Amino acid sequence: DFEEIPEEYL
Amino acid sequence: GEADCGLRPLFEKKSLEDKTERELLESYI
Amino acid sequence: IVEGSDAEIGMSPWQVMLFRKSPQELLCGASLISDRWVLTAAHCLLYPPWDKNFTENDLLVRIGKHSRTRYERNIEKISMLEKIYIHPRYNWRENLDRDIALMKLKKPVAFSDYIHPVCLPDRETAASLLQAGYKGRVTGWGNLKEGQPSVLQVVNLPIVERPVCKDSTRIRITDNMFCAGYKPDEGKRGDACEGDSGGPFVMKSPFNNRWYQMGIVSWGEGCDRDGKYGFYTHVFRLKKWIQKVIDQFGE
Ligand SMILES: Clc1ccc(-n2cnnn2)cc1
Ligand code: NA
């Protein structure tokens, strides 16, 4: 359901 | 406790109230 | 939150979201108590019966949020955990007694209109405000029903007399837990629900007009059931442990 948080956080 | 804790910038800092915090106050009897 | 309303913007600026990295999902709520310390429920991190045992790298925290699922660009901040500290006598085997944990963020989160810590109580604040009938406020993005909300939900619920709490359940209640909720006769309703665990139960001091966090959403038997109440970690009883952890491992 969740929009993708920027990859810099992953 | 942190000097400025628990005072919200869009409410306490500006002296505005939210829609139901009086329900809490009205209960502190 | 069952039977709540939509939060207003910046109404709950300490509200944090415990967010799993992979898969991407809400786990629990949490609360910002300093620029680098988030408070949550120990069972959001460690609950062996359900094979739950997270480390710092499984998780992210999301501060500044209103919308549940959307990425709030220029508004929210997302943080990496640097350390988890579970209360050493958190009882996951029995009744979630001492259901409290801290998380040290890797770098201090910057405050704004949408991001601001809540106060922790002192002995006097607790004496004065933790009384049956006095209402606190519960916030979260958990289920609306025992379906899911677009934005953060709020509900104000009265602290319930201790005898009435114990008699609503077969679980052994401890001094580190209070319950809150309307009775079947009181007409109004509301409760936390799944995903709301960890989040703040707070009260606005009438004495200094500061929001203090009195409880942590800890458990209940269903959501918004008549004759049942949600149980909260008594935050002031476990605060010497909070200060201890912050005084040692903090910067
Ligand atoms: Cl305080 C409280 C905590 C968790 C629940 N939930 C039980 N099942 N899902 N959420 C209800 C009340
Ligand atoms: Na109930």
* Contact of C84 with C56, CB cutoff 8 Å: yes
- Interior angle at CA B21, CA C126 and CA C114, nearest 5: 95
- Three-class secondary structure of residue C127 per DSSP: helix
Residues linked to residue C79 through DSSP beta bridges, in sequence order: C61
Q: Do C71 and A10 touch (CB under 8 A)?
A: no
CB contact under 8 A, B10 and C158: no
Q: Which chains touch B (3 or more CB pairs under 8 A)?
A: C
**CATH classification for the domain delimited by B1-29, as one of 2.60.40.10, 1.10.1740.10, 4.10.140.10, 3.90.550.10:** 4.10.140.10
Q: Is the CB of C220 under 6 A from ligand 1?
A: yes
Minimal-distance CA residue of chain B relative to C211: B6
Alpha carbon separation from C92 to C49, C120, C180 (Å, rounded): 8, 24, 21
Which residue does chain C place closest to A10, by CA atoms?
Answer: C21
For C120-148, give one letter per residue: b (16+ CB within 10 A) or e: bbeeebbebbbeeebbbbbbbbbbbeeee
Give the resolution value in Å.
2.2
Residues in CB range of C81: below 8 A, 6 or more apart: C56, C57, C59, C60, C61, C103, C104, C105, C106
- B10 and C137 within 8 Å at the Cβ level: the answer is no
Do chains B and C have 3 or more beta-carbon pairs under 8 angstroms?
A: yes
- Domain boundaries for CATH 2.40.10.10 within chain C: 1-12+118-236, 13-117+237-250
| Every domain of chain B and the residues it spans | 1-29
- Report the residue from B7, B21, B23 with minimal CB separation from C210: B7
How close, in Å, is residue C13 to chain B by CA atoms?
Answer: 7
Query: Do residues C21 and B17 lie in contact, with contact meaning Cβ atoms separated by under 8 Å?
Result: no
The type of residue at C210 is R
Number of Cβ within a 10 Å radius of residue C94: 9
DSSP state of C69: S
Half-sphere exposure of C1 (CA within 13 A, CB side): 24
Which technique was the structure solved with, according to the deposited record?
A: X-ray
Q: Which of B4, B10, B14 is the mutation pick for testing C, counting most C CBs within 10 A?
A: B10
Pick the CATH number of C1-12+118-236 from 2.40.10.10, 3.40.50.2300, 3.40.50.720, 3.40.50.300: 2.40.10.10
Q: What span, in angstroms and rounded, lies between the C-alpha atoms of C34 and C38?
A: 7
Q: Does C215 touch chain B (CB under 8 A)?
A: no
Q: What is the CATH number of domain C13-117+237-250?
A: 2.40.10.10
C165 φ, ψ to 5°? -70, -50
Q: Which helix (H) or strand (E) holds C77?
A: strand C77-86
DSSP, collapsed to helix, strand or coil, labels residue B6 as coil
**Alpha-carbon distances, residue C172 vs B7, C45, C87, C175, C224 (angstroms):** 36, 22, 19, 10, 20
